Scaffold this active site. Structure first.
Site, short mmCIF file in Angstrom:
data_model
loop_
_atom_site.label_atom_id
_atom_site.label_comp_id
_atom_site.label_asym_id
_atom_site.label_seq_id
_atom_site.Cartn_x
_atom_site.Cartn_y
_atom_site.Cartn_z
N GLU A 31 0.81 -1.22 0.00
CA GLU A 31 0.00 0.00 0.00
C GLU A 31 0.86 1.29 0.00
O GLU A 31 1.89 1.37 0.64
CB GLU A 31 -0.95 -0.01 1.18
CG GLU A 31 -1.94 -1.17 1.15
CD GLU A 31 -3.03 -1.08 2.21
OE1 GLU A 31 -2.82 -0.36 3.25
OE2 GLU A 31 -4.08 -1.80 2.04
N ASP A 80 -8.76 -9.56 2.62
CA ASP A 80 -8.95 -10.89 3.11
C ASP A 80 -7.61 -11.62 3.13
O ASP A 80 -6.54 -11.05 2.91
CB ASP A 80 -10.01 -11.63 2.26
CG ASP A 80 -9.63 -11.77 0.80
OD1 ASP A 80 -8.43 -11.58 0.45
OD2 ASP A 80 -10.47 -12.07 -0.08
#
EC number: 5.4.99.27
Length: 334
Positions: A31, A80
């Site tokens: 990220e 997830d």
């Protein structure tokens, strides 16, 4: 409504198959906040590598370790167990001491770096993500190689991936049934996203997918601002689009003006004209119309074949673009 699998291909449908995300290590996402931590303030930003659990699970365990309430830990979005993510978390802990976050242990996770920061991390606020993926059992190397080459040049369609529509298509199905709060949000998001995908699929059927027309909404590369094409500026605007300085956009339908005018607005309207029920739902629920780039130009696209049937691909995409949308133009996975 055009089905996901029938969405128009920019490079045409692939002439071969492979495996995406066969194991979590084949799908690594780093990220990108878009900034470095301030190095001061009431929040601790902590970059955690996670492999084998979801974002809420780590954030609960970080809360507990800091002896703070769960609500005090925030992040960009919940991810997830199926990919490896270096995900940013954010803990509110007042004052100017630093807890030893290097002593935080949780199965399948690694604390990578941490620093104070003045503002809270909020859902959807990333700049983007850098991806490292390994595609396995590739049936047609020659086809994937050419497609990678052609993507450097022409990009891919900026479709919402299958994930946006919920498991089994449930979020879009829910939208369609309702058009006759967490769930409310997922349904509206599915509806507008499906409409966007359809207007892109239709635009890709034109002879020249990058032809600017009068009334098009052109967005500046790398930010949200956009303005409207006019006939006298068209040769100049075309040049900027060709040079990837401007992005032709497609509507995310909703209330207010979609933002295109004249011929471009007529085209967008006609592309989703049968979908009056989803349109009315979005307007009713005050989901403001917006613009989204039609194409996606993966940044720092690089790749490496380890053998005739295995390739490791790297690229960076802005927030809200999907790695699966890049991979759809390389291999068939259904």
């Amino acid at each position: 409504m055009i089905e996901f699998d029938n969405l128009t291909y920019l490079h045409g449908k692939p002439q071969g198959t492979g495996l995406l995300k066969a194991n979590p290590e084949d799908f690594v996402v780093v990220e990108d906040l878009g900034f470095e931590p301030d190095g001061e303030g009431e929040h601790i930003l902590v970059r955690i590598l996670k492999n084998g659990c979801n974002t809420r699970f780590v954030a609960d365990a970080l809360a507990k370790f800091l002896k703070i309430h769960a609500r005090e830990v925030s992040f960009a979005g919940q991810k997830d167990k199926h990919a490896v993510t270096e995900q940013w978390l954010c803990a509110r802990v007042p004052g100017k001491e630093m807890p030893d976050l290097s002593a935080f242990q949780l199965e399948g996770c690694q604390v990578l770096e941490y620093a104070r920061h003045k503002r809270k991390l909020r859902l959807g606020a990333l700049k983007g993500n850098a991806f490292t993926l390994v595609l396995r059992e590739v049936s047609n190397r020659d086809d994937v190689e050419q497609r990678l080459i052609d993507i450097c040049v022409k990009g891919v369609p900026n479709y919402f991936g299958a994930q946006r529509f919920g498991i089994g298509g449930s979020n879009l199905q829910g939208a369609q049934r309702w058009a006759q709060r967490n769930k409310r949000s997922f349904w509206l998001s599915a509806a507008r996203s499906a409409l966007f995908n359809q207007i892109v699929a239709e635009r890709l059927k034109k002879a020249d997918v990058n032809q600017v027309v009068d009334g098009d909404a052109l967005q500046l590369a790398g930010r949200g601002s956009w303005f409207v094409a006019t006939t006298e500026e068209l040769a100049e605007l075309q040049r900027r689009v060709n040079d990837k300085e401007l992005m032709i956009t497609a509507a995310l339908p909703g209330s207010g003006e979609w933002g295109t005018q004249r011929e471009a607005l007529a085209f967008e309207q006609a592309a989703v004209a049968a979908e009056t029920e989803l349109q009315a739902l979005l307007v009713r629920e005050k989901v403001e119309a917006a613009r989204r780039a039609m194409l996606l130009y993966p940044q720092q696209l690089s790749w490496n074949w380890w053998d005739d049937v295995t390739v490791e691909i790297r690229f960076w995409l802005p927030a809200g673009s999907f790695a699966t949308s890049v991979v759809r133009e390389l291999i068939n996975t259904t």
